[PDB]
């Protein structure tokens, strides 16, 4: 020895710049939603930016299909899933001539969070398909003049799970069932994730307040849907390296 | 005398906090936008937010139907008010084949503005179906080197009519035809809304300045179109407790 | 003489009001992208701002035709060119029975920048189809955990053309094929484009937070596409004072 200590300090040095990197405020943070259909198929919606990343998804992008993913056929919407199902769950019995529940009603959804991120300040938002806003406790959907719309429960962190990429924990990841106990059965989002900042200096405001405002909608939103869990795992998770909990509770 | 004044005191006490809640810079703001068409459709836009609110609308938004609410039959366009007649719309004389006005192009609006609102600030933008900025007083619309984008007109506080709920004022509504005359006859619209402040720190930038870029968009924006006003009033504006000025002039 | 030097005058201050007012922060800044099909279609989206403009496009707008412009049968996929097709773009050999480039798959495009303009610091970003960041020098599309995004290459400005309107600079024009050369082949894009500033103060943070948050959405949107440029200039940009370069390298 050592014939190759350099090749293997050099190896080194590249695991650890691309491992660290995640800590600089121009690498990428990841916000990834995957809505479940009892079809089998997984709607992907996924958010990148620097400092923040927020977003949200009404009713018309939480169903399958829709403007942004049709069907195989190319459409949008499908019989008895229309604008009178729609009418139906904005408004208890306000619907006419509709399936009870849709194919392309969502049961379930994934949240996933990865990169260098402040993970006690994220927040993720339910509401009802009306807009109203959602609180647990069976209290209903609430109005505009009594709705919270910063609540301790949009404080999620404590309820996701760690999800691991070698040595380190890449992301976090939430799991819910959308039957009106800890989520509403028809539901739409909206949520907030932040940079996890390795100094005091507020890079989103002051001299960084021009690029921290343009970062908030200059990174395109990928989304598709895919037959299934395992077809979006191995062509769309696994190749961008972001990790993702499967059906049976193992990082993937 | 006095058997019940705790089940009194807790009652108003309760009535005191929904109705000051309003003020919280945690309560939300709604903006609803809300098109009418010659048919008798009303499409509804609801935006929420807590310290601004901020949005527009392309004339793909502007029509009925769209990608966002299609109609029964699924279509997001309808024959002769589609490709070849939007470019009529865009330049005059620079259509072919379509009607003359689509039952789908949408003839008034009311903007509905509600919560605890600087109104003063209020920001109403209008601009042709091209994008260029129209002016009132008849120049027509502006180039893009002529154009201003913030006029003393963009100012809509004192056209905006006050909505009441019980005895407060809820909100303000302004009401405008699409006529060439006070509106562009085929418009597309920006709004700005601020969250009216009881004191004098700025929550939209310093220690607040991430919690205000991100709110810009972390709320699911809310649409449907409904086949009158009257069904609109009762599945969706009454029961979220949204004031909305009807076609007789009678807050609902 | 001089019989008509007010006349001169009055028409001279006029000039000098409208070519200089494009320095005011009130004045709007354009940015415009013009996607190019082999069928000659152009897709044109065109944003306006007064202090930042930054935006993107996915696979779902960068296609032609889609949601926001479908053809002329009101369509917004083709066949083998739907959903299948675009997982064959997302990830190598993970399509099925679609054709191999779309018709509606854009070969290049123009992005062009007009207004006062901080012309050093435009981004444009370009990403892959799954949205993994692409670099130059054909390193592949970068994964999430080593993904710069904000690279030195965002900055464009030097490889933007100046386009003038009489005697001024009016705006820049960046040309690009999509090859997997200077751009991908299958590109989804962010940019951030910001306002020439006249003065030290910082209008978009400050006093100033609260309307330059607002104003990042608060702009509609232009957006259709037209049979061939000769029609799109004619009937859009020419009228609207928007300079453009055409197929043979002349500003119109």
């Known amino acids: 020895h050592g014939l190759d200590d ?14 660290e990197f995640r800590s600089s405020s121009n690498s990428g943070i990841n916000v990834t939603v995957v809505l479940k259909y009892t079809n089998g198929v997984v709607q992907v919606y996924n958010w990148q930016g620097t400092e923040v990343i927020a977003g949200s998804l009404n009713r018309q992008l939480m169903k399958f299909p829709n403007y942004m993913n049709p069907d195989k056929h190319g459409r949008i919407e499908w019989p008895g899933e229309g604008v009178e199902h729609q009418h139906g769950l904005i408004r208890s019995n306000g619907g006419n001539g509709s399936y009870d529940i849709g194919a392309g009603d969502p049961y379930a959804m994934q949240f996933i969070v990865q990169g260098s991120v402040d993970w006690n300040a994220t927040r993720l938002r339910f509401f009802g398909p009306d807009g109203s806003r959602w609180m647990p406790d069976d209290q209903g959907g609430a109005s505009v003049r009594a709705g919270l719309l910063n609540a301790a429960e949009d404080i999620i962190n404590s309820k996701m ?15 819910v069932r959308f039957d009106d106990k800890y989520a509403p059965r028809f539901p739409t989002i909206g949520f907030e994730v932040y940079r996890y900042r390795v100094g005091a200096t507020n890079e989103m405001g002051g ?46």
Chains 1, 2, 3 share one sequence.
């Open 6 to 19: 350099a090749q293997y300090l050099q190896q080194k040095a590249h695991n650890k710049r691309i491992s």
């Open 207 to 252: 001299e960084s307040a021009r690029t921290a405002v343009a970062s908030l909608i200059s990174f395109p939103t990928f989304s598709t849907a895919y037959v299934n869990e395992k077809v979006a795992v191995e062509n769309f998770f696994q190749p961008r390296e972001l990790v993702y909990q499967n059906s049976y509770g193992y990082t993937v």
């Open 161 to 175: 799970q760690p999800l691991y990429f070698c040595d380190r924990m890449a992301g976090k990841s939430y799991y």
